[PDB]
Design a protein around this ligand. Structure first.
Ligand SMILES: CCCCCCCCCCCCCCCCCC(=O)OC[C@H](CO[C@@H]1O[C@H](CO[C@H]2O[C@H](CO)[C@H](O)[C@H](O)[C@H]2O)[C@H](O)[C@H](O)[C@H]1O)OC(=O)CCCCCCCCCCCCCCCCC
Ligand SMILES: CCCCCCCCCCCCCCCCCC(=O)OC[C@H](CO[C@@H]1O[C@H](CO[C@H]2O[C@H](CO)[C@H](O)[C@H](O)[C@H]2O)[C@H](O)[C@H](O)[C@H]1O)OC(=O)CCCCCCCCCCCCCCCCC
Ligand code: CLA
Ligand code: CLA
Ligand code: CLA
Ligand code: CLA
Ligand SMILES: CC(C)=CCC/C(C)=C/CC/C(C)=C/CC/C(C)=C/CC/C(C)=C/CC/C(C)=C/CC/C(C)=C/CC/C(C)=C/CC/C(C)=C/CC1=CC(=O)C(C)=C(C)C1=O
Ligand SMILES: CCCCCCCCCCCCCCCCCC(=O)OC[C@H](CO[C@@H]1O[C@H](CO)[C@H](O)[C@H](O)[C@H]1O)OC(=O)CCCCCCCCCCCCCCCCC
Ligand SMILES: CC1=C(/C=C/C(C)=C/C=C/C(C)=C/C=C/C=C(C)/C=C/C=C(C)/C=C/C2=C(C)CCCC2(C)C)C(C)(C)CCC1
Ligand SMILES: CC1=C(/C=C/C(C)=C/C=C/C(C)=C/C=C/C=C(C)/C=C/C=C(C)/C=C/C2=C(C)CCCC2(C)C)C(C)(C)CCC1
Ligand SMILES: CC1=C(/C=C/C(C)=C/C=C/C(C)=C/C=C/C=C(C)/C=C/C=C(C)/C=C/C2=C(C)CCCC2(C)C)C(C)(C)CCC1
Ligand code: OEX
Ligand SMILES: [Cl-]
Ligand SMILES: [Cl-]
Lengths: 348, 31, 75, 30, 32, 36, 318, 35, 37, 449
């Protein structure tokens, strides 16, 4: 063993057992992925089932409270906690499970365990790939999801006041987080998000076009209507005609892939690139460094009242979103805006 | 009887069955 | 044994003919007994607003939270 | 002249697409 | 709640009719 | 295995699952979360 | 040989660098028409009174604006869904002021994209390929039709149609949620799942094939030949068939985009998404706010702001 | 005499991709650069 | 409401409208017993 | 039954194994008809049971009853529902009829022969047999013509359809002078689909509706006789794919378009879809709101005529680009709206402020007020409201439901047309299954670039 022959150690024993053909590949990474992921997802379920944000966000976020799947959500801790890790033994909960849940401790529990779970999952990708003796492109591709999670669930919250301004684990919670970014950060105008949207839309186009092309250039390797039956798992010849596909797109779109490798490499590069771009943009928002508006048009609109563009119109919308949600979205600010101070358009 | 496969099956199924019973009772609670 | 083989073993069904029912019943009793409200400190439909506070509670002290949240919950 | 700069960029991008379709390397490979 | 109760009774009988036909046919080696 | 048509087992279990989801929608218009 | 026949051949000729077709006969001119006006408009078009409130919004790089801010202003609300051909306009200047270019571009564009779908099938039939590539292209075309036609019609004005511009697209999206809560629409949720899932599947499939063909051999024949299948995390046999996998690679994204497009069309008929505002109530009746209520608070802000001077009555039934 | 001496290789598609990317990136950031 | 004589049959009419959706489910059940030949 | 090993079609394509089984195909179609008739009867009786006379049908989320009401059944002056027993009769009839069709389908799907050509030659048919195919189309074409004439008969005999534009108040009226002028009847067909023209959705008079059904009824019956005694001409045979899937694709494409047209009819038309039973149309609701405030403010003491708004384009009234005086506000887009409650106040030139100043009848107000509140705006959970509204009202315009449902149906059926049509064309060519792997056409084509 070890290109030298060495005495077997307990590590070798544990290694073979963990790295052993099993219903599911436990491996060494599983020691981190299995436990953390279970607690994270389990905590999210328990929270959405019977946990309230009445004392953290003053909102009902639990099926027991009467919330549905969409409304139910594990809300972030109160802004008073700031960037406190809020452990159950922390100086806040002081070893009180009931209070730890009331203080919003479960959110940190799910986030922390989930974060390490993602690390364990990526490590599992490398582990399995190394055993299969294949380049770990899948793991490198899983970097984009992890980057998004860290930038949106860690960097941003840390750059802001506290975990309170972080995405809460819930369908409606994510929706309000999205709307908040438009009203305060103008995330849509941010060029990095634009590149990110391009990647997701581009990857979807690639996925659909690739499946359609291959499934429509398939060779007749069967004598039945069902083409799926006409395929051998250990076949060597390609089931579809790359040539026919190349000519079709060369004439329909004007350009077409000629290397299957490059095509698939492009299929994985587009999505990963886009996610990483958006992550950099979220890093800027964490520090409030955002492309909110173009001063050139702002100055022109102020000096020239008539001048107007969709850009100026969107600025006004953001102004309404911030003024007509800050009172509740940010209860710590304790902002009581007289209705007259709120910006309202004619009628409505 | 308690293999990794068995443990995984009961690691989620048993909790889920309980949670489902709780959610059902919640559907009959009156304010 | 394939899951299908087990999903056909009537013995497996008999084995879960009691445990599975009990697991569900326990879940129903858990909420019906009101233990869930006490275990997770989830406010009951009649204790969201106290006579003292008729507005949503706002925790402001991080290191004085334990006592604050308890007071907000009206103990 | 910012508009002139913008028009140049837009025109340039379209020009690249043009040669990428008509002056592209012959697809000898499938 | 008598109406609701008999409503559920109707739902059970009607919903069970389709499987009933299949089970019976299968049991007697019918052409299903 | 045997004495048990798996197709029936699926049909029954599936019917029960539909029923459970129906109870959830029922609770949507009744008791808590019913907007009334 | 009959000249018409000779012409018919040239049209169906596959030797053409870009296959022309009977569909292309109508697609080429329509798209060429839309492209020309779009380029001139996005550069020299004068301001347009989209809200029909005599307040013209500036556009085109010449009239200030920018690549991001610049856009083709949608037709005026006064015109509504009325046909506004250049000849109907008294002067080309009026046609520009009322926002005619947008209607012309959209009309010459939608016809082109529909003909583009037909052209796809035409070449597939000419090459001898299966005829369902266009069905996949139907998903994007359906979405474009909803934002540039179905919705404008349902609302009752081309002004509602998504403006042909980056900033205009964002404005359309914001106002839409403020009035339809698209985020809480189950169909839009399916569409987001389609794009998010499609990206995930694209990254995985690309990685698997790349790592495999890393070397004509089947996409995975290499790894399959080794037999070291990654069933460790890929414990399944549903997509063992490459045709089965590729089918899903196309069905997941296309079907999702179809739902989001239909969702937008339904909301165009005033069928807004789930509304759970004040759904949770306490024993005495006090309303317990939820995340949905917070989303509503934002929606109110966008609503009270959109068209600051284009509402003379409280209800925005329009 | 370094045997490690190699040569960079740029193909037509690679050139097109590069020029397209550098132009698209400019079109995207040009507006922000001029603010 | 249904005529007074047909009133006692309201529960049944409340279940009739959903019967059609059961037919498609029955089709898949038949294929299940058929083993999807 | 059948297995893929003998058909080449998997269970998910089982019904495709019935293409050459005329007898089984008959049972399938006959059975499906039973399902359609069943729902028509079942849902109708369900609506009748869940109907309440204290609320309008639209508030009760009823879609089938409005159809019978429009036919002029159990309705009275103002659209008031006198009795509902006629509706009960319809449900009972359809429900029992569905049983007969169901039995026939089951029989022609089990006991009935898989094919009919061998025994019943008349019913026996083979795709591609154009003569027989055209004859079958003819029979069904005549049936549809008879159905249209049945409606025409109900309009001029056996009572009459409800006329929302009836003189001296809206109520059922026996059409006695149906429009037969081709220019008027076919004018709608050549009308632009854009605003104002509204294509065939513009039909606002029952006379044209009944007259149009007279035209379509006759043409369909005559066309059926033609297809029954004629075979496709060479040009047609050289420009059409003769196969069952091809025939289905043609029907799928057509029915898909019809679905979209129906969606627009339910959303825009108020004549064929009485607002009394189907509720107000989007444009109707907007115009109603403008009228409601205009009336209220005028009574308070506001001159709606010289009331400049913030933009200066008239707060209550303004001029259409054409010149017609129209209600002010964003409702300017719905200036082409026409409703029985607003027409009396209108005149040669848009609205008549004279009528608006005096002669405004109380009903003209009450109706507008009710429409304004019951606008088509709604949510999936049926929380009635423009948007950003609390969960208090439980109402979604029936027009919204029909418009959204039929639009989606039309979209899918159009996609079905693309799928079946393309597959039918590929099947005829022979490359539906895939490339030969030895006769790949591309390999024989020019190397292009
Ligand atoms: C899983 C999916 C959800 C399943 C819910 C099952 C029960 C349900 O559905 O829930 C709804 C009802 C049962 O609940 C009742 O739903 C009603 C819905 O409003 C309807 O009734 C109201 C009564 O005030 C109003 O009249 C309102 O106008 C009318 O629309 C009311 O909310 C009642 O209070 C409530 O008890 O069942 C139904 O409707 C059954 C509906 C059958 C199919 C209807 C298709 C409609 C068109 C679809 C295609 C177009 C657009 C699709 C967009 C997505
Ligand atoms: C056709 C496509 C263009 C439609 C253009 C349009 O302005 O659309 C609306 C028109 C209807 O127009 C309106 O029709 C109205 C009809 O109501 C009028 O007449 C009524 C009679 O009861 C009432 O009196 C009412 O008050 C009165 O206003 C009016 O004429 C309006 O002025 C007029 O704008 O649709 C129509 O004419 C019917 C057109 C056929 C149905 C098309 C449905 C959509 C199809 C596909 C969508 C998806 C495509 C995907 C890609 C492919
Ligand atoms: C409108 C829905 C519909 C209808 C009318 C039919 C009709 C038919 N199908 Mg079919 N099918 C459907 C949906 C439908 N299908 C769907 C959704 C699927 C996908 C799961 C399939 C998949 C499928 C396959 C794979 C096959 C068929 C076949 C057939 C034909 C004969 C069925 C058979 O061989 O055994 C008959 C089935 C039974 C005897 C079981 C019960 C069915 C009965 C007749 C239903 C009666 C219910 C009702 C309550 C009875 C009323 C009685 C009255 C007194 C009230 C038949 C004409 C077969 C065929 O002919 O292929 C060539 C075949 O192989 N189907
Ligand atoms: C009357 C119209 C009609 C008819 C007669 C047919 C007939 C047929 N189609 Mg088809 N199709 C239609 C409309 C129609 N289609 C439309 C509108 C679409 C667009 C969505 C399609 C898309 C389509 C596809 C993609 C395919 C077919 C296929 C087939 C053949 C296989 C039958 C089969 O699947 O076996 C048994 C029946 C089934 C397996 C159906 C299972 C039940 C479905 C899946 C559940 C759906 C429930 C739905 C959500 C309820 C709401 C419906 C509506 C309100 C939206 C068959 C001859 C297959 C084929 O190979 O063509 C030759 C096939 O691949 N069709
Ligand atoms: C599209 C509608 C339709 C069509 C085209 C047919 C066509 C046919 N039916 Mg039929 N049938 C239908 C609807 C239809 N049926 C319905 C709704 C029912 C329910 C009452 C029946 C019940 C029925 C019976 C009981 C019988 C037929 C029979 C027949 C065949 C010969 C008829 C005959 O009198 O000679 C004989 C023929 C091919 C006969 C047959 O042998 O089936 C093939 C026969 O016994 N049908
Ligand atoms: C569902 C209704 C329907 C359908 C499916 C058809 C279908 C068809 N008709 Mg037709 N027809 C109809 C209604 C219908 N018709 C009516 C209502 C009339 C009375 C005005 C006619 C009068 C008619 C004539 C005079 C002719 C056809 C012809 C044809 C065939 C040629 C293709 C075509 O589309 O026509 C024409 C081509 C285009 C529309 C393109 C075709 C299979 C032709 C034929 O093949 O002779 C049988 C023929 O000459 N039809
Ligand atoms: C006057 C004027 C000009 C006005 C216009 C103004 C205007 C609208 C300006 C906007 C300009 C603009 C484009 C702005 C966008 C800027 C922006 C967001 C940039 C993002 C840049 C970036 C690097 C983003 C990160 C994410 C990323 C890398 C995304 C890539 C997206 C992408 C290119 C995906 C693919 C797109 C696409 C169309 C693919 C086609 C594939 C293809 C040829 C298929 C053919 C084919 C397929 C097969 O399956 C098989 C088998 C074969 C054989 C085969 O061949
Ligand atoms: C593992 C599953 C994780 C998601 C569980 C979702 C869930 O439990 O929903 C639980 C919710 C509970 O639904 C809510 O229950 C409350 C009980 O007091 C009230 O009755 C509310 O009115 C009701 O909406 O289910 C629903 O949203 C109703 C529709 C059914 C949705 C099931 C989705 C399951 C998959 C996701
Ligand atoms: C936090 C924490 C923890 C953990 C915990 C856990 C892990 C839990 C779990 C929990 C769980 C594990 C839960 C479960 C859940 C599930 C459920 C609740 C279910 C749901 C479902 C439903 C609701 C359904 C619906 C429907 C459909 C859609 C499908 C079918 C069926 C039906 C139809 C019905 C620990 C210990 C570390 C300590 C510390 C803290
Ligand atoms: C073939 C086949 C199929 C199916 C088909 C079908 C769909 C059938 C149906 C059929 C039918 C279609 C049936 C129905 C029936 C019904 C009936 C039989 C009715 C009766 C009625 C009565 C008895 C009475 C009632 C009443 C009145 C009316 C008055 C009031 C009161 C009451 C409501 C009680 C499937 C899919 C499975 C696949 C396989 C094959
Ligand atoms: C009742 C009534 C009326 C009347 C209505 C009507 C008169 C309707 C009709 C309508 C119609 C009149 C329909 C028809 C349709 C047809 C069509 C629209 C055609 C199509 C064609 C096709 C589809 C073909 C194509 C193609 C070409 C030519 C090339 C080659 C290839 C093919 C052959 C494929 C009115 C108005 C008074 C209103 C009220 C009610
Ligand atoms: O234009 Mn576009 O946007 Ca749909 O809402 Mn009514 O009209 Mn105006 O307002 Mn908000
Ligand atoms: Cl705006
Ligand atoms: Cl207004």
């Amino acid at each position: 063993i070890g290109t030298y022959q060495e005495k077997r150690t307990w590590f070798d024993d544990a290694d073979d057992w963990l790295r052993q053909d099993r219903f599911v590949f436990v491996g060494w990474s599983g020691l981190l992925l299995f436990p953390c992921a279970y607690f994270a997802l389990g905590g999210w379920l328990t929270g959405t089932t019977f946990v309230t944000s009445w004392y953290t966000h003053g909102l009902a976020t639990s099926y027991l409270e009467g919330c549905n799947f969409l409304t139910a959500a594990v809300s972030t801790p109160a802004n008073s906690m700031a960037h406190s890790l809020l452990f159950v033994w922390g100086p806040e909960a002081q070893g009180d499970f009931t209070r730890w849940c009331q203080l919003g401790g479960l959110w940190a529990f799910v986030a922390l365990h989930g974060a390490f779970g993602l690390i364990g999952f990526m490590l599992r990708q490398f582990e399995i790939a190394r055993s299969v003796n294949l380049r770990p492109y899948n793991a490198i591709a899983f970097s984009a999801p992890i980057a998004v999670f860290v930038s949106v669930f860690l960097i941003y919250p840390l750059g802001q006041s506290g975990w309170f301004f972080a995405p809460s684990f819930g369908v409606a919670a994510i929706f309000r987080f999205i709307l908040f970014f438009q009203g305060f950060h103008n995330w849509t105008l941010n060029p990095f998000h634009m590149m990110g949207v391009a990647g997701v839309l581009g990857a979807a186009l690639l996925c659909a076009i690739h499946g359609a092309t291959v499934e429509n250039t398939l060779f007749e390797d069967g004598d039945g209507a069902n083409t799926f039956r006409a395929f051998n798992p250990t076949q060597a010849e390609e089931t579809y005609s790359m040539v026919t596909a190349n000519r079709f797109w060369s004439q329909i779109f004007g350009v077409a892939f000629s290397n299957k490798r490059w095509l698939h490499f492009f299929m994985l590069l587009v999505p990963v690139t886009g996610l990483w771009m958006s992550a950099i943009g979220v890093v800027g928002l964490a520090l409030n460094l955002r492309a909110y508006d173009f001063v050139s048009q702002e100055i022109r609109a102020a000096e020239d009242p008539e001048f107007e563009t969709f850009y100026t119109k969107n600025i006004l919308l953001n102004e309404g979103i911030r003024a007509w949600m800050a009172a509740q979205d940010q209860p710590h600010e304790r902002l009581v805006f007289p209705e007259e101070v709120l910006p309202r358009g004619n009628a409505l | 009887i308690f293999t990794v496969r068995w443990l995984a099956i009961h690691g989620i199924a048993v909790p889920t069955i309980f949670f489902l019973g709780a959610i059902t009772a919640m559907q009959f609670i009156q304010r | 044994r394939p899951f299908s083989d087990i999903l056909t073993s009537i013995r497996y069904w008999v084995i879960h003919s009691i445990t599975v029912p009990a697991l569900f019943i326990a879940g129903w009793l858990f909420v019906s007994t009101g233990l869930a409200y006490d275990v997770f400190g989830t406010p009951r439909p009649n204790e969201y607003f106290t006579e003292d506070r008729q507005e949503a509670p706002l925790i402001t002290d991080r290191f004085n939270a334990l006592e604050q949240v308890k007071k907000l919950s009206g103990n | 002249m910012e508009a002139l700069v913008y028009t140049f960029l837009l025109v340039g991008t379209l020009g690249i697409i043009f040669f990428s379709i008509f002056f592209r390397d012959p697809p000898r490979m499938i | 709640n008598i109406e609701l109760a008999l409503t559920l009774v109707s739902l059970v009988l009607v919903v069970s009719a389709g499987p009933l036909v299949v089970v019976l046919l299968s049991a007697r080696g019918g052409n299903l | 295995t045997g004495r048990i048509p798996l197709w029936l087992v699926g049909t029954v279990v599936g019917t029960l699952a539909i029923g459970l989801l129906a109870v959830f929608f029922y609770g949507s218009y009744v008791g808590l979360g019913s907007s009334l | 040989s009959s000249l018409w026949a000779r012409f018919c051949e040239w049209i169906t000729s596959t030797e053409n660098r870009l296959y022309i077709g009977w569909f292309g006969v109508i697609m080429i001119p329509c798209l060429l028409t839309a492209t020309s006006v779009f380029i001139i408009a996005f550069i020299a078009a004068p301001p347009v009174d989209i809200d029909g409130i005599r307040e013209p919004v500036s556009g085109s790089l010449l009239y200030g604006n920018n690549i991001i801010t610049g856009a083709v202003i949608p037709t005026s609300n006064a015109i509504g869904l009325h046909f506004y051909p250049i000849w109907e306009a008294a002067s080309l200047d009026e046609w520009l002021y009322n926002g005619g270019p947008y209607q012309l571009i959209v009309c010459h564009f939608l016809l082109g994209v529909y003909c583009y779908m037909g052209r796809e099938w035409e070449l597939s039939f000419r090459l001898g390929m299966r005829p369902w590539i266009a069905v996949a292209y139907s998903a994007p075309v359906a979405a474009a039709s909803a934002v540039f036609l179905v919705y404008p019609i349902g609302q009752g004005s081309f002004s509602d149609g998504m403006p042909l511009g980056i900033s205009g697209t964002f404005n359309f999206m914001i106002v839409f949620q403020a009035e339809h809560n698209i985020l809480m629409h189950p169909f839009h949720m399916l569409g987001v799942a389609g794009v998010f899932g499609g990206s995930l599947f694209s990254a995985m499939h690309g990685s698997l094939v790349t790592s495999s063909l890393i070397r004509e051999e089947e996409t995975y024949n290499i790894v399959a030949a080794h037999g070291y299948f990654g069933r460790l995390i890929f414990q399944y046999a549903s997509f063992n068939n490459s045709r089965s996998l590729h089918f899903f690679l196309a069905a997941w994204p296309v079907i999702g985009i179809w739902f989001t497009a239909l969702g937008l069309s339904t909301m165009a008929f005033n069928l807004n998404g789930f509304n759970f505002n004040q759904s949770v109530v306490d024993s005495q009746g006090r309303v317990l706010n939820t995340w949905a209520d917070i989303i509503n608070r934002a929606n109110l802000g966008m609503e009270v702001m959109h068209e600051r001077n284009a509402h003379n009555f409280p209800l925005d039934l329009a | 005499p370094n045997p490690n001496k190699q040569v960079v290789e740029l193909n037509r598609t690679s050139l097109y991709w590069g020029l397209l990317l550098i132009f698209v990136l400019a079109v995207l950031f040009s507006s922000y650069i001029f603010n | 409401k249904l005529p007074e004589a047909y009133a006692p049959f309201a529960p049944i009419v409340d279940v009739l409208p959903v019967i059609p959706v059961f037919f498609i489910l029955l089709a898949f059940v038949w294929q299940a017993a058929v083993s999807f030949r | 039954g059948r297995d893929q090993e003998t058909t080449g079609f998997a269970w998910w394509s089982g019904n495709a194994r019935l293409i050459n089984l005329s007898g089984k195909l008959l049972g399938a179609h006959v059975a499906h008809a039973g399902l359609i008739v069943f729902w028509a009867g079942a849902m109708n009786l369900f609506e009748v049971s869940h109907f309440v006379p204290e609320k309008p049908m639209y508030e009760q989320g009823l879609i089938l009853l409005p159809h019978i009401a429009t036919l002029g059944y159990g309705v009275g002056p103002g659209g008031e529902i006198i009795d509902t027993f006629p509706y009960f009769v319809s449900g009972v009839l359809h429900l029992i009829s569905s049983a007969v069709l169901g039995f026939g389908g089951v029989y022609h799907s089990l006991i009935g022969p898989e094919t009919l050509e061998e025994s019943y030659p008349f019913f026996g048919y083979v795709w591609k047999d154009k003569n027989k195919m055209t004859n079958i189309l003819g029979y069904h074409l005549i049936m549809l013509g008879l159905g249209a004439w049945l409606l025409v008969w109900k309009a001029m005999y056996f009572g009459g359809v409800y006329d929302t534009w009836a003189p001296g108040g809206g109520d059922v009226r026996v059409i006695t002078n149906p429009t037969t002028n081709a220019a008027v009847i076919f004018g709608y067909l050549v009308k632009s689909p854009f605003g104002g023209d509204g294509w065939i959705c513009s039909v606002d008079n029952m006379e044209d509706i009944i007259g149009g059904h007279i035209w379509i009824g006759t043409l369909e019956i005559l066309g059926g006789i033609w297809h029954i005694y004629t075979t496709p001409w060479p040009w047609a045979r050289r420009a059409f794919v003769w196969s069952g899937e091809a025939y289905l694709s043609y029907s799928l494409g057509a029915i898909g378009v019809m679905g979209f047209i129906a969606c627009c009819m339910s959303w825009f038309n108020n004549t064929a879809y009485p607002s009394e039973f189907y509720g107000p149309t989007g444009p109707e609701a907007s115009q109603s709101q403008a009228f409601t405030f205009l009336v209220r403010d005028q009574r308070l003491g506001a001159n709606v005529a010289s009331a400049q708004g913030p933009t200066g384009l008239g707060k209550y009234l303004m001029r259409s680009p054409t010149g017609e005086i129209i209600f002010g506000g964003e409702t300017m887009r719905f200036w082409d709206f026409r409703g029985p409650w607003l027409e009396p106040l209108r005149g040669p030139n848009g609205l008549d402020l004279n009528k608006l100043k005096n002669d405004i009848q109380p009903w003209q107000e009450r109706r507008a007020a009710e429409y304004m509140t019951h606008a088509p705006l709604g949510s999936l959970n049926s929380v009635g409201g423009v948007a950003t509204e609390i969960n208090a009202v439980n109402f979604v315009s029936p027009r919204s439901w029909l418009a959204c449902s039929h639009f989606c149906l039309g979209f899918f059926f159009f996609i079905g047309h693309l799928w079946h049509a393309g597959r039918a064309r590929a099947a005829a060519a022979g490359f539906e299954k895939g490339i030969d792997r030895f006769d790949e056409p591309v390999l024989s084509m020019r190397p292009l670039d």
